[PDB]
Amino acid sequence: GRGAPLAVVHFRDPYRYKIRKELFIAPEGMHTGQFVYCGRKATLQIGNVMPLSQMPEGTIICNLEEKTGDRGRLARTSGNYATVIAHNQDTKKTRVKLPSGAKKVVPSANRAMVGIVAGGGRIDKPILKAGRAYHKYKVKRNSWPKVRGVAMNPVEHPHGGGNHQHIGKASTVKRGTSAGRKVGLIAARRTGRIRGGKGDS
Amino acid sequence: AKRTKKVGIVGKYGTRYGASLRKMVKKMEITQHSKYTCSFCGKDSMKRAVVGIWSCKRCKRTVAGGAWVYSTTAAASVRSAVRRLRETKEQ
Amino acid sequence: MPREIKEVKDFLNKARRSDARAVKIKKNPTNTKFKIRCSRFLYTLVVQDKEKADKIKQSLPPGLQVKEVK
Amino acid sequence: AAHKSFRIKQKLAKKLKQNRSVPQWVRLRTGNTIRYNAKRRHWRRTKLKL
Amino acid sequence: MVQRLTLRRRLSYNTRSNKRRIVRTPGGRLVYQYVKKNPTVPRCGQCKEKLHGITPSRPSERPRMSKRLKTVSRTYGGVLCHSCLRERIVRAFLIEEQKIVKALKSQREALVK
Amino acid sequence: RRLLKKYRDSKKIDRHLYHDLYMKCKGNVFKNKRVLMEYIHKKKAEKQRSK
RNA sequence: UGGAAGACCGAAACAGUUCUGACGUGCAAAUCGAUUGUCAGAAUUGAGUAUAGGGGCGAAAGACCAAUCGAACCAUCUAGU
RNA sequence: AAUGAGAGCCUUGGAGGACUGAAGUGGAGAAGGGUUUCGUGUGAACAGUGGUUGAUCACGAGUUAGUCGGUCCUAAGUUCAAGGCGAAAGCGAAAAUUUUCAAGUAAAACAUAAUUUUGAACGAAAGGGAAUACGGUUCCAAUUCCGUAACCUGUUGAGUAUCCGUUUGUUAUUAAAUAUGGGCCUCGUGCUCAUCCUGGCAACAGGAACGACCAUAAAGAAGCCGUCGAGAGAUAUCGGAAGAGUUUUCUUUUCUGUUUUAUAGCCGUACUACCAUGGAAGUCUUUCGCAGAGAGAUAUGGUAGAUGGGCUAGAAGAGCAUGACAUAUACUGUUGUGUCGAUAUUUUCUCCUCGGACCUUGAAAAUUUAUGGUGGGGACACGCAAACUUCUCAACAGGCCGUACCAAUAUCCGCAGCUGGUCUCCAAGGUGAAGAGUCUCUAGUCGAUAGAAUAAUGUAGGUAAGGGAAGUCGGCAAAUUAGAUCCGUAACUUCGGGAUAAGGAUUGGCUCUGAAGAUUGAGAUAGUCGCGAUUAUCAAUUAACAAUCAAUUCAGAACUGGCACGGACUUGGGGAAUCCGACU
RNA sequence: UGAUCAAAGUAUCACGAGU
RNA sequence: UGCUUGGACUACAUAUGGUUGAGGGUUGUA
């Protein structure tokens, strides 16, 4: 239920004389047996993890911490990557572009693995059978093949109902409309075909 | 016999699931199951174990890769880019 | 009676043991076998010769009880 | 069941004792209401059930 | 026909710990006995290529067995893969050897500054 | 293939020839038992004439 | 040669298409016959186990939740009016 | 036939028609039942009928385990001690915070000194899993009683490198000497070294030959389908110890009978993996299926799992099977014989080596072991030794709870001995593609209240000239069609299908013939001893070389019958359009 | 693609006991 | 010691007494 494979990477524990193995998120070009070096004083090599001050801008990173020591919140799933866009010298921040095209500013102490997370493009295969859609879901959780609430009855959904055939009100519903009126297009700024040049400025 | 000119591998899916979808399948199911050159053994003995993981039958060096392809198009560019920035920072 | 003793000399060593209160002797027209009960291996020597079998009956130590299955 | 837990076996065992027809000399007592053992549990008439 | 077969165990089901091999029992009665899963060879586990000289037993039968049967006498009897043990002596040797070459080069460079 | 196997030890045909023949076991042209040796002997014979 | 597929014919299996058949104070508070769908997988299912009432669950019929569901059952308010 | 008051069933033999038809109405178990099991007595009530008999009614008996389950363990998941919150209870709560709530030492000096953060537990009689077999025995019980033989765990005793440098013995040789070293002194038993195993190049071999302690790995540990390799039991079939049956005729025929345990020792393949030799090109080796080879193939020589089988111990001319003898006989004793092949089918399973499929990639925990490392102790050679020894044998102990039978048209749940529902294990012959249907054998039934009539009307099953859907809401019901092999095969199409399109041919029996496999052997010559025996040589021979053994497949040809030929059974009517949802 | 625990070292004092 | 049987004990919250403790809370002797 994670499309991206993980690496079991085993280290010395510098505190007790024992091997402690931790699960990192496997970047492409991470072959078993490559030495990975996790550090401030690290060479920029795939999959070394380095605090973001150390990597020159336009380096791509995976597994990036939003707060230093929060163990790598971002870019965990297949082919997503953040790019270091540069730095704000005052209050030691490295600014990144998130895989949403959203740009966010993060402290430079934040560690990130130089990488593009393996089995990407997981998306490319269309499917063909809904047996495989079932098989995907039964690993993950009970994400039901989505029964249309129109098809139902008005007790069951506010959208179902009908001699004829409707939602009957804009499926576009407020943020403030309070649960369970959030059947649909929850605060749609614009609805109807996205025309054009998508990518944030 | 070249039994089927058009379908090749997508003849498993036969009549079901519309021709345009079946053309897309043909490329991907060729790239997966295909023996790739292992950079670490120089032998073409690398086959797809599972979705993102390619194990070389000999040397047993198991490499992380793209889901259908050992090297995804993004990756090649990715790896060259980081490498080039590495040179300028050092000297 | 799980353990086989092919060799006469070893069977006799087991005859003078702290254990082996009981022996069974059977003279069979198929195969004449000398059985010694130590409770969990009972050991058996099969003397195939039959001439050797008549003489091997004593060398059995006398303090040991023998069942003379005819 | 078929191999009954010990607690069950004790309860059933007591129940087997109950299934006996009253000694007929007890029926002859002065102000003896007891004609019969009448709580005779015959297994396919009255279970124990539930 | 001949002689049909009865479950000695109350575990009726074809479940993994219930497998039955057919045995001509001496009275000719032909009755089933219950067979334990055939033990899978302990693996050489850095490349899982099945340990020579090391007995396959259901794990809790390796203290009901002699200590010598579980063992190949040299360093990394079970743990490492024989062929892979030549590799792993070599690997360690080289990492250590060429580090000394690096260390000697740095020492000389410091003096000669 | 087993016919070729026996022949390999005796030594009648060269290893080279056996390979070509072994690949022709698979892929029909040696249809019966009877076809295979008639071909072997013709191959041998054609080589004897050239030699 | 090989042996893929929520493939097809059809058993075990599951379901219940049509006869608007038998039965319909029956064997049965849903059975029986004929006929028939499907049967290697979004299959069939047991045990353990979770979800409980204006709630759940629902491949969604307002269906089902112990012969009971357009809001279970049980007691009480309640000999309610 | 027997018995009784009465007997179609139910009481029952013998007999006789059949039934289910080994995917069971059989033989076991779980879930369930709760005395229902079984003997005896046996009447009324009950068995919608009778009923002497029963799952009834009355009276007794019966379910014995260290090794099978429960137990133990964890899973999904749960019970709950918290800081809290609640009206409290409790939390349709997993809250989980709680000095060190934590696990801890065969450890001592200076915060003793290392590490280590929900305590706790329950939760599967199908998951995981300490360890039992065979025969006999009850009315009713057995992997359980008994007999006999094992196996595990805990614990307890003995043994398991060592006898040397040296030497008693021997003038020496030599031997005890597992293997001892070096030097001195005329010499020495004088100085004196070791001894927590050995061998193999390796793959790795073995009976033991430092658990104190750390880390690390493996086992436990896992879907589905397909095929291969190998086995067990069933099956097919021949001979030969036996019996039975048929025997008008024919039949060495038909049926049946020929068995081998846990456990241990040795052997140990197909397969695979690995090692040594060696260096392949002219691609080789090779699978059914294409996997490997300068990451070392082929080949040659080995090694290893004990995978599967063999032979022995087990096994008292055992036990047990078969046919006889003794005693009317029982009980019991005695007499032989228990054996030789062939095959792949699996109307079955197990196990090995593999692969297909996947936006599925196919448990966890207890538990067990392995290896590296750091202590220490044992560190005398006249050699004593020892060794949680995760050794080899023997001693003792192993508690707690369950165990009958039923598992279904009569022991379950439905008011019921109710055509209902209710999970699985077990696998005979023939036909055949089938674990199909059908018949049969074994096992189990023959109870479904019956007899006589066998009306109508039914129900359930069929047939019907000639016409052939005119019927009807509507081809509904019914029929045609069906398997196989061969020939032929459209519209349309997403090129995969449509397709078994349509449309045609043919199918028995008997008698021949061909094709399709396995294995060694011949042939020719020479020497020796009396065609026989012993020894030596060589490649061709080679498509069945020939010979023999195997076991059926696919094809072709006659003869032949009254069109009889998928003869039972199995088993699509077809085509042309339209509406609708893509599809399962 | 591999292993790290037992502070060795160095320095200063203790430099006691037994023979 | 081993093996085996019987009795009595071993919940939690909490007060007090008991003694061990403890914190760069904080005081003092040095």
Swiss-Prot record, chain A:
Q: Report the GO terms under cellular component.
A: cytoplasm; cytosolic large ribosomal subunit; cytosolic ribosome; nucleolus
Chief subcellular location equals cytoplasm
What is the protein's given name? Answer: Large ribosomal subunit protein uL2
Provide the family line: Belongs to the universal ribosomal protein uL2 family.
Q: Where is this region: Disordered?
A: 156-178
- Give GO terms: molecular function aspect only: RNA binding; rRNA binding; structural constituent of ribosome
**Known tissue expression:** In larvae tissues examined: gut, brain imaginal disk, salivary glands, fat body, muscles, epidermis and trachaea.
Give the GO biological process terms. cytoplasmic translation
- What residue stretch is flagged as signal peptide? none
Instruction: List localization entries.
Output: Cytoplasm
Q: What does the UniProt keyword field contain?
A: Cytoplasm, Ribonucleoprotein, Ribosomal protein, RNA-binding, rRNA-binding
Swiss-Prot record, chain C:
Q: Which gene encodes it?
A: RpL38
Q: Which UniProt keywords apply?
A: Ribonucleoprotein, Ribosomal protein
Q: One Pfam family name from the record?
A: Ribosomal_L38e
BP term (GO), one: protein-RNA complex assembly
Protein name per UniProt = Large ribosomal subunit protein eL38
Is Ribonucleoprotein given among the entry's keywords?
yes
Give the family this protein belongs to, as stated in its UniProt record.
Answer: Belongs to the eukaryotic ribosomal protein eL38 family.
The record's section on InterPro entries has: Ribosomal_eL38, Ribosomal_eL38_sf
Q: Which Gene Ontology molecular function entries are recorded, alphabetically?
A: structural constituent of ribosome
Gene Ontology CC, one term: cytosolic large ribosomal subunit
Origin species: Drosophila melanogaster (Fruit fly)
Keyword Ribonucleoprotein assigned to the entry: answer is: yes
Curated annotation (Swiss-Prot), chain D:
Q: What name does the UniProt record give this protein?
A: Large ribosomal subunit protein eL39
Drop me one GO molecular function for this one.
Answer: structural constituent of ribosome
Listed under GO cellular component are: cytosolic large ribosomal subunit
Short name of one Pfam family: Ribosomal_L39
For this UniProt record, give its keywords in alphabetical order, as a comma-separated list. Answer: Ribonucleoprotein, Ribosomal protein
Tell me the protein family, please: Belongs to the eukaryotic ribosomal protein eL39 family.
Q: Name one GO biological process term.
A: cytoplasmic translation
Gene name on record? RpL39
InterPro entries per the UniProt record, alphabetical:
Ribosomal_eL39, Ribosomal_eL39_CS, Ribosomal_eL39_dom_sf
UniProtKB/Swiss-Prot annotation, chain F:
> Membrane-spanning regions, if any?
none
Q: List the disulfide bonds.
A: none
Family assignment?
A: Belongs to the eukaryotic ribosomal protein eL19 family.
Q: What is this protein called?
A: Large ribosomal subunit protein eL19
Species of origin: Drosophila melanogaster (Fruit fly)
Q: Lineage, please?
A: Eukaryota, Metazoa, Ecdysozoa, Arthropoda, Hexapoda
Range within the parent protein: 103 to 153 of 203
